[PDB]
Scaffold this active site. Structure first.
Site, PDB file in Angstrom:
ATOM      1  N   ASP A 109     -22.938  73.756  24.251  1.00  0.00           N
ATOM      2  CA  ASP A 109     -23.671  73.807  25.467  1.00  0.00           C
ATOM      3  C   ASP A 109     -24.863  74.750  25.392  1.00  0.00           C
ATOM      4  OD1 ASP A 109     -23.759  72.555  27.907  1.00  0.00           O
ATOM      5  OD2 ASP A 109     -22.469  74.035  28.948  1.00  0.00           O
ATOM      6  N   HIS A 134     -28.579  65.291  27.141  1.00  0.00           N
ATOM      7  CA  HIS A 134     -27.929  66.607  26.974  1.00  0.00           C
ATOM      8  C   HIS A 134     -26.527  66.452  26.474  1.00  0.00           C
ATOM      9  CE1 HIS A 134     -26.219  70.528  27.710  1.00  0.00           C
ATOM     10  NE2 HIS A 134     -25.421  70.034  28.646  1.00  0.00           N
ATOM     11  N   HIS A 180     -30.186  68.134  32.599  1.00  0.00           N
ATOM     12  CA  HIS A 180     -28.786  67.750  32.690  1.00  0.00           C
ATOM     13  C   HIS A 180     -28.542  66.260  32.861  1.00  0.00           C
ATOM     14  CE1 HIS A 180     -28.283  72.139  33.542  1.00  0.00           C
ATOM     15  NE2 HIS A 180     -27.318  71.943  32.660  1.00  0.00           N
ATOM     16  N   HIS A 202     -18.806  66.487  30.242  1.00  0.00           N
ATOM     17  CA  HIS A 202     -18.724  67.908  30.698  1.00  0.00           C
ATOM     18  C   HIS A 202     -19.686  68.290  31.815  1.00  0.00           C
ATOM     19  CE1 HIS A 202     -22.234  68.979  28.084  1.00  0.00           C
ATOM     20  NE2 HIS A 202     -22.347  69.993  28.934  1.00  0.00           N
ATOM     21  N   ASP A 203     -20.658  67.398  32.096  1.00  0.00           N
ATOM     22  CA  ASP A 203     -21.661  67.587  33.147  1.00  0.00           C
ATOM     23  C   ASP A 203     -21.824  66.339  34.057  1.00  0.00           C
ATOM     24  OD1 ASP A 203     -22.679  70.344  32.902  1.00  0.00           O
ATOM     25  OD2 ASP A 203     -24.025  69.601  31.244  1.00  0.00           O
TER      26      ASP A 203
HETATM   27  C1  LIG Z   1     -33.376  75.908  26.136  1.00  0.00           C
HETATM   28  O1  LIG Z   1     -33.091  77.114  26.852  1.00  0.00           O
HETATM   29  C2  LIG Z   1     -32.060  77.118  27.752  1.00  0.00           C
HETATM   30  C3  LIG Z   1     -31.020  76.205  27.793  1.00  0.00           C
HETATM   31  C4  LIG Z   1     -30.019  76.310  28.744  1.00  0.00           C
HETATM   32  C5  LIG Z   1     -30.043  77.335  29.683  1.00  0.00           C
HETATM   33  C6  LIG Z   1     -28.947  77.503  30.683  1.00  0.00           C
HETATM   34  N1  LIG Z   1     -28.913  78.579  31.394  1.00  0.00           N
HETATM   35  N2  LIG Z   1     -27.835  78.804  32.197  1.00  0.00           N
HETATM   36  C7  LIG Z   1     -27.690  80.219  32.628  1.00  0.00           C
HETATM   37  C8  LIG Z   1     -27.527  81.164  31.441  1.00  0.00           C
HETATM   38  C9  LIG Z   1     -27.410  82.607  31.921  1.00  0.00           C
HETATM   39  N3  LIG Z   1     -28.586  82.963  32.739  1.00  0.00           N
HETATM   40  C10 LIG Z   1     -29.507  83.931  32.473  1.00  0.00           C
HETATM   41  O2  LIG Z   1     -30.542  84.055  33.131  1.00  0.00           O
HETATM   42  C11 LIG Z   1     -29.297  84.869  31.291  1.00  0.00           C
HETATM   43  N4  LIG Z   1     -30.497  85.731  31.109  1.00  0.00           N
HETATM   44  C12 LIG Z   1     -31.630  85.172  30.505  1.00  0.00           C
HETATM   45  O3  LIG Z   1     -31.724  83.982  30.291  1.00  0.00           O
HETATM   46  C13 LIG Z   1     -32.754  86.108  30.171  1.00  0.00           C
HETATM   47  C14 LIG Z   1     -33.004  87.185  31.235  1.00  0.00           C
HETATM   48  C15 LIG Z   1     -33.499  86.522  32.525  1.00  0.00           C
HETATM   49  C16 LIG Z   1     -34.069  88.176  30.751  1.00  0.00           C
HETATM   50  C17 LIG Z   1     -31.662  87.910  31.462  1.00  0.00           C
HETATM   51  C18 LIG Z   1     -30.441  87.036  31.611  1.00  0.00           C
HETATM   52  O4  LIG Z   1     -29.428  87.455  32.143  1.00  0.00           O
HETATM   53  C19 LIG Z   1     -28.727  82.101  33.932  1.00  0.00           C
HETATM   54  C20 LIG Z   1     -28.838  80.629  33.551  1.00  0.00           C
HETATM   55  C21 LIG Z   1     -26.938  77.879  32.659  1.00  0.00           C
HETATM   56  O5  LIG Z   1     -25.966  78.196  33.326  1.00  0.00           O
HETATM   57  C22 LIG Z   1     -27.272  76.475  32.219  1.00  0.00           C
HETATM   58  C23 LIG Z   1     -26.123  75.463  32.340  1.00  0.00           C
HETATM   59  C24 LIG Z   1     -25.086  75.680  31.300  1.00  0.00           C
HETATM   60  C25 LIG Z   1     -25.313  76.358  30.192  1.00  0.00           C
HETATM   61  C26 LIG Z   1     -26.639  76.945  29.840  1.00  0.00           C
HETATM   62  C27 LIG Z   1     -27.803  76.507  30.770  1.00  0.00           C
HETATM   63  C28 LIG Z   1     -31.086  78.262  29.641  1.00  0.00           C
HETATM   64  C29 LIG Z   1     -32.094  78.169  28.689  1.00  0.00           C
HETATM   65  O6  LIG Z   1     -33.174  79.013  28.578  1.00  0.00           O
HETATM   66  C30 LIG Z   1     -33.327  80.096  29.498  1.00  0.00           C
HETATM   67 MG   LIG Z   2     -22.500  72.222  33.014  1.00  0.00          MG
HETATM   68 ZN   LIG Z   3     -24.029  71.166  29.723  1.00  0.00          ZN
END
Ligand SMILES: COc1ccc(C2=NN(C3CCN(C(=O)CN4C(=O)CC(C)(C)CC4=O)CC3)C(=O)[C@@H]3CC=CC[C@H]23)cc1OC
Ligand SMILES: [Mg+2]
Ligand SMILES: [Zn+2]
Length: 333
Positions: free
Chosen positions: A237, A88, A84, A124-125
């Site tokens: 994002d 990004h 972040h 945005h961040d």
């Molecule tokens: C390059 O890969 C990634 C880039 C950004 C992120 C971010 N993650 N998150 C949240 C997204 C929702 N989340 C989850 O864990 C969703 N999820 C999975 O990823 C797989 C699972 C564990 C099997 C089940 C499940 O529910 C939590 C984290 C953010 O909030 C960050 C900030 C803003 C936007 C995206 C960013 C994640 C990446 O790879 C995992």
């Molecule tokens: Mg953010």
């Molecule tokens: Zn962002």
């Protein structure tokens, strides 16, 4: 706040970016960063050039100068964390430019709205410290307290807005100063609404309202414009999985290290640590990308492309292609 010195501007202005099409879907920000020492000036130059090549600041009375000030005021509020950081938000800016212009999403928006999205990407961040909203709540830190006391569970997003509104309140970095009346109001309100919709706790809700609005011919038009802006910033994002595999992998490495550092600090304080943040579990990059693809990204891009962003079809194609490539990495590790 301090003002932006003339040497800082020249440091950006000088970067010539040879062999780089900033408008191309396969643009590689990682290559661009390795192309020189001081990648922070190449980063800013990419943002500068994107915003000029759109044609948009000129039409809204934003000078070549306050644009550059605005960018550099934004840059200075980004910390040196693994994901972040300033790179990004430049990536989100560049990616949004491709959705608007290669994906033909510009057709669905006014020119003002396109300009606001490109700007909003960069704010945005602001002042992200590498820790998520959950961390601030569980550790009852002041920002978590402050956000809990005002009602909103979107701890960081409210914070990024407060800082956006603060940068814009200095006239030498106010890229919306050339706007009046309803236009000026709409720039601020849409910027803020878009940043608040980046909270992934609200992911399902925002997706479902955009899709409902796009299925309905009789949707309020202003409301569909606003949801489309929010969806596009959200799309930017979570756009890392829509890029050429090597780029997508580099983004996954940076995110993973940032999450691991949060987990180490949670261990120090005795606060609970989810397995994604736990460095010792030592889970494979690939399984985590596939899970992100299946649970979050593939559904999101497939649904919005089908509902109305037909020009963004390549995103769905590249997610599918990247997924199969990570499947091949498991099968041969
Ligand atoms: C390059 O890969 C990634 C880039 C950004 C992120 C971010 N993650 N998150 C949240 C997204 C929702 N989340 C989850 O864990 C969703 N999820 C999975 O990823 C797989 C699972 C564990 C099997 C089940 C499940 O529910 C939590 C984290 C953010 O909030 C960050 C900030 C803003 C936007 C995206 C960013 C994640 C990446 O790879 C995992
Ligand atoms: Mg953010
Ligand atoms: Zn962002």
């Amino acid at each position: 706040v301090t003002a932006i010195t003339k040497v800082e501007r020249e440091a950006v202005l000088v970067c010539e970016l040879p062999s780089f099409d900033v408008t191309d879907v396969e643009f590689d920000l990682f290559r661009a960063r390795e192309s020189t020492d001081k990648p922070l000036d190449v980063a800013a130059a990419i943002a500068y050039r994107l915003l000029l090549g759109s044609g948009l600041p000129q039409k809204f009375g934003c000078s070549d100068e306050v644009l550059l000030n605005f960018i550099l005021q934004c840059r200075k509020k980004y910390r040196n964390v693994p994901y972040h950081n300033f790179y990004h938000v430049v990536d989100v800016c560049q990616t949004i430019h491709t959705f608007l212009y290669r994906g033909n999403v510009y057709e669905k928006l006014t020119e003002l709205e396109c300009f606001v999205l490109l700007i909003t990407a960069l704010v945005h961040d602001l002042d992200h410290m590498g820790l998520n909203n959950s961390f601030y709540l569980k550790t009852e830190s002041p920002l978590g307290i402050l956000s809990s006391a005002s009602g909103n569970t979107s701890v960081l997003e409210v914070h990024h807005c407060n800082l956006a509104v603060e940068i814009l309140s200095d006239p030498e970095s106010d890229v919306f100063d050339g706007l009046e009346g309803a236009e000026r109001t709409l720039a601020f309100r849409s910027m803020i609404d878009c940043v608040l919709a980046t909270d992934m706790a609200k992911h399902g809700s925002a997706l479902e309202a955009f899709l409902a609005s796009a299925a309905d011919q009789s949707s309020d038009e202003a409301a569909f414009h606003r949801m489309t802006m929010e969806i596009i910033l959200k799309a930017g994002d979570i756009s890392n999985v829509t890029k050429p595999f090597d780029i997508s992998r580099q983004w996954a490495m940076a995110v993973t290290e940032e999450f691991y550092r949060q987990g180490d600090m949670e261990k120090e304080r005795g606060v609970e640590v989810l397995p994604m943040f736990d460095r010792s579990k030592n889970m494979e990059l690939a399984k985590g990308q596939i899970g992100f693809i299946d649970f979050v990204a593939a559904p999101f891009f497939q649904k919005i492309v089908d509902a109305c962003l037909q020009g963004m079809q390549w995103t769905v194609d590249r997610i599918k292609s990247n997924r199969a490539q990570w499947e091949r990495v498991l099968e041969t590790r």
